[PDB]
């Protein structure tokens with residue numbers, strides 16, 4: 339009712355709850371209204387934007403409330419990681435990214451990717467660009483993880 343849902347394409351929504359913030363600021367709506375949240379035609383701020391001080395990040399910095407830049411504090415807002423993301427493109431079977439595989443493999447880290455503009459800042463990145471270190475390529479280069487230059491079947495289906 340007073341809980342606002344922030345829907346995400348590949349994960350459960352993050353739910354902003356007024357109750358706990360009101361008990362915190364003593365119903366002073368002025369703290370967050372028409373200053374922090376214009377709530378008129380907002381974009382979908384990214385976590386990096388929040389790290390810059392936008393959205394929830396205007397407070398969740400570590401000083402006032404837990405920071406949005408803490409791998410151990412993501413659970414404070416997000417329930418989990420996400421559901422398996424399926425990538426579609428012409429020329430190969432669906433490429434699938436799973437967290438069940440990766441997170442437990444990176445000691446539970448999250449910002450390694452989510453706060454890495456070279457790993458998340460793209461849209462329909464190609465294998466060429468992955469080779470130059472973009473997206474999956476930032477780690478699948480035979481140093482960190484198996485190279486993206488080959489191993490097609492390890493990521494793509496029907497291969």
Ligand code: HEC
Pocket residue numbers: 425427428429430433434460461462463464465466473474478485486487488489490491492493494
């Ligand atoms: C052998 C070297 C491979 C072939 C042939 C292809 N891949 Fe990949 N791949 C993966 C993902 C998650 C994506 C999508 C990323 C995004 O869209 O942002 C891709 C994309 C492609 C594409 C489309 C772009 C292009 O034409 O270059 C094709 C046709 C494609 N891939 C063919 C993931 C991975 C990966 C996991 C680390 C590996 C090893 C490969 N891809 C290997 C090949």
Ligand code: HEC
Pocket residue numbers: 346347348349412413416418419420423435437440441444446447448449450451452
């Ligand atoms: C790189 C190896 C990653 C690590 C480590 C973590 N995540 Fe992840 N996550 C990654 C990808 C490839 C994707 C899809 C990217 C996209 O275009 O959306 C995701 C997705 C999520 C999401 C969904 C975001 C959305 O739907 O808008 C969330 C909420 C998310 N990831 C959270 C998350 C957490 C909490 C992690 C630590 C336990 C974590 N991810 C690690 C890549 C990577």
Ligand code: HEC
Pocket residue numbers: 341342343354356359360363365366367368369370371375377380
């Ligand atoms: C910061 C901690 C907040 C305080 C204090 C209050 N509100 Fe708020 N409100 C806040 C956010 C992050 C949002 C989500 C806006 C968005 O961009 O999606 C909201 C939303 C509302 C709404 C709209 C509800 C909806 O349509 O989902 C209303 C009607 C609203 N807020 C009222 C309200 C009142 C009256 C407050 C004091 C009693 C108040 N808010 C405080 C953030 C915060």
Ligand code: HEC
Pocket residue numbers: 344346352381382383384385386393394395398404405406407408409411412414415416448449452458
């Ligand atoms: C509550 C203060 C949050 C904490 C702490 C974390 N996230 Fe978050 N995340 C939150 C919201 C409200 C939203 C949507 C904001 C909007 O305007 O739409 C999100 C969104 C993300 C996304 C998608 C966008 C992006 O940056 O890629 C992801 C992938 C996500 N959040 C991941 C994430 C991680 C890994 C966190 C820990 C470092 C993290 N979030 C903490 C609110 C909050």
Ligand code: HEC
Pocket residue numbers: 352353354355358359362369370374393394395396397398402403414415
């Ligand atoms: C400052 C003006 C705030 C803004 C903007 C947002 N939050 Fe916040 N949050 C703030 C404080 C000072 C606290 C209180 C202390 C506590 O630990 O409870 C919080 C707390 C939360 C919590 C924790 C709730 C709990 O059960 O303890 C969550 C999950 C949270 N905040 C989420 C959240 C989101 C998603 C916001 C942006 C959409 C957001 N907060 C903004 C102060 C402020």
Ligand code: HEC
Pocket residue numbers: 433434435439440443444450451457473474475476477478482483484492493
């Ligand atoms: C570094 C943070 C990574 C990024 C970015 C992505 N992956 Fe990854 N991947 C990484 C590691 C550490 C490992 C371990 C490899 C090993 O065997 O030592 C992996 C593993 C995978 C796998 C193998 C899964 C399994 O067989 O259980 C796949 C299929 C895979 N990774 C796919 C993948 C895709 C599609 C990515 C981009 C969206 C991606 N990974 C990013 C580290 C990292």
